[PDB]
């Protein structure tokens, strides 16, 4: 099945196996097919990979870090070997190539990658991750609802996460959290590049900090050379994360953030239109888009948009990823939180600032 979008060239790639306890064998040969069954896709890699490094996983994460350093700072793509499923080690590897070298990683335990049964199958999944994270778009919506067509509406979603959890019901409006927040860049709706944020007063810091963050997301929209310095006219927002109780809270709290947002872009009297929509199922809470453009065809041109999603509810899953991903990146705040309750907010805030993304892969979709 070829993608729809090919991603930008890979052509410097390799791989990095971390050694179990039994060796593996046939290696180059996994890693030839693997190039092999991705070109098949459209994805244009490299069929010559470097030679790559095997090396067993040492005590320490300093260690390994000093270990890959020159093999992930070399090139723009590795394909890592676990020696087992083991996520630790995982996310060790996300925090070196995330972070601290800004290279574009997939990790595949070796006896799956290896096993000829099944590969085919496997490297086809394998690969639509890749040709995401280097640019590309995996799946065609060739007959998009009108409101999706005319490549003049951005869909956004984002989740608020509480890093800790007291284990008393609903945390706090006060309660330091971390957003996660996705956007579309253009017509095809491959591309959801992420934002992270720390939030250490909590919702007082959403509110000090949604309004420039949002501005920057239209600012990605029109600097992106397919949209022709254009705005989006429309904008689809999916908020997770929140319960029925905290609904009022979104609609009356953080959306007039977003609207903000859009009178310090858009020419003067050219406010885009704007559909909020939670999930607690999923309840749209404010619309400007649906009633407006389709009367009683709304609930139902809302529903096929977002099953055509599906096809190709990724707003929120794409949130979701972001911030599980922030979760591992920002390791001296969670090794912080297993000691006190509450850390310092300066230090929340800096151990955000510590565990952001490179800024090699800084509008990429690193998380998928």
């Given at each position: 099945?070829?993608?729809?979008?090919?991603?930008?060239?890979?052509?410097?790639?390799?791989?990095?196996?971390?050694?179990?306890?039994?060796?593996?064998?046939?290696?180059?040969?996994?890693?030839?097919?693997?190039?092999?069954?991705?070109?098949?896709?459209?994805?244009?890699?490299?069929?010559?990979?470097?030679?790559?490094?095997?090396?067993?996983?040492?005590?320490?994460?300093?260690?390994?870090?000093?270990?890959?350093?020159?093999?992930?700072?070399?090139?723009?793509?590795?394909?890592?070997?676990?020696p087992?499923?083991?996520?630790?080690?995982?996310?060790?590897?996300?925090?070196?190539?995330?972070?601290?070298?800004?290279?574009?990683?997939?990790?595949?335990?070796?006896?799956?990658?290896?096993?000829?049964?099944?590969?085919?199958?496997?490297?086809?999944?394998?690969?639509?991750?890749?040709?995401?994270?280097?640019?590309?778009?995996?799946?065609?919506?060739?007959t998009?609802?009108?409101?999706?067509?005319?490549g003049?509406?951005?869909?956004?979603?984002?989740?608020?996460?509480?890093?800790?959890?007291?284990?008393?019901?609903?945390?706090?409006?006060?309660?330091?959290?971390?957003?996660?927040?996705?956007?579309?860049?253009?017509?095809?709706?491959?591309?959801?590049?992420?934002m992270?944020?720390?939030?250490?007063?909590?919702?007082?810091?959403?509110?000090?900090?949604?309004?420039?963050?949002?501005?920057?997301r239209?600012?990605?929209?029109?600097?992106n050379?397919?949209?022709?310095?254009?705005?989006?006219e429309?904008?689809?927002?999916?908020?997770?994360?929140?319960?029925?109780?905290?609904?009022?809270?979104?609609?009356?709290?953080?959306?007039?953030?977003?609207?903000?947002?859009c009178?310090?872009?858009?020419?003067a009297?050219?406010?885009?239109?704007i559909?909020?929509?939670v999930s607690?199922?999923?309840?749209?809470?404010?619309?400007?888009?649906?009633?407006?453009?389709?009367?009683?065809?709304?609930?139902?041109?809302?529903?096929?948009?977002?099953?055509?999603?599906?096809?190709?509810?990724p707003?929120?899953?794409?949130?979701?990823?972001?911030?599980?991903?922030?979760?591992?990146?920002?390791?001296?705040?969670?090794?912080?939180?297993?000691?006190?309750?509450?850390?310092?907010?300066?230090?929340?805030?800096?151990?955000?600032?510590?565990?952001?993304?490179?800024?090699?892969?800084?509008?990429?979709?690193?998380?998928?």
């Amino acid at each position: 099945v070829k993608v729809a979008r090919p991603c930008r060239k890979i052509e410097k790639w390799t791989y990095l196996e971390l050694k179990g306890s039994k060796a593996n064998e046939g290696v180059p040969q996994a890693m030839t097919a693997f190039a092999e069954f991705l070109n098949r896709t459209g994805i244009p890699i490299n069929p010559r990979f470097s030679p790559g490094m095997s090396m067993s996983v040492p005590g320490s994460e300093k260690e390994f870090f000093a270990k890959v350093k020159e093999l992930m700072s070399s090139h723009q793509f590795v394909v890592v070997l676990l020696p087992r499923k083991d996520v630790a080690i995982y996310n060790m590897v996300k925090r070196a190539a995330d972070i601290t070298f800004g290279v574009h990683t997939v990790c595949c335990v070796a006896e799956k990658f290896l096993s000829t049964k099944g590969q085919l199958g496997y490297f086809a999944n394998v690969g639509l991750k890749v040709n995401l994270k280097f640019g590309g778009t995996n799946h065609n919506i060739k007959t998009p609802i009108p409101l999706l067509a005319k490549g003049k509406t951005m869909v956004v979603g984002y989740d608020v996460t509480h890093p800790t959890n007291l284990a008393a019901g609903q945390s706090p409006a006060s309660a330091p959290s971390i957003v996660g927040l996705v956007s579309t860049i253009d017509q095809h709706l491959g591309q959801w590049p992420a934002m992270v944020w720390n939030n250490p007063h909590g919702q007082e810091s959403m509110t000090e900090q949604f309004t420039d963050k949002f501005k920057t997301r239209l600012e990605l929209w029109r600097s992106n050379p397919a949209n022709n310095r254009s705005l989006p006219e429309n904008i689809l927002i999916f908020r997770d994360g929140v319960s029925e109780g905290q609904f009022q809270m979104v609609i009356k709290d953080e959306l007039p953030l977003v609207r903000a947002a859009c009178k310090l872009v858009y020419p003067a009297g050219k406010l885009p239109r704007i559909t909020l929509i939670v999930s607690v199922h999923y309840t749209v809470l404010v619309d400007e888009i649906f009633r407006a453009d389709y009367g009683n065809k709304a609930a139902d041109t809302l529903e096929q948009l977002t099953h055509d999603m599906c096809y190709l509810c990724p707003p929120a899953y794409y949130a979701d990823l972001v911030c599980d991903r922030a979760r591992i990146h920002q390791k001296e705040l969670f090794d912080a939180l297993d000691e006190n309750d509450s850390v310092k907010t300066d230090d929340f805030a800096r151990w955000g600032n510590s565990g952001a993304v490179h800024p090699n892969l800084r509008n990429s979709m690193y998380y998928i």
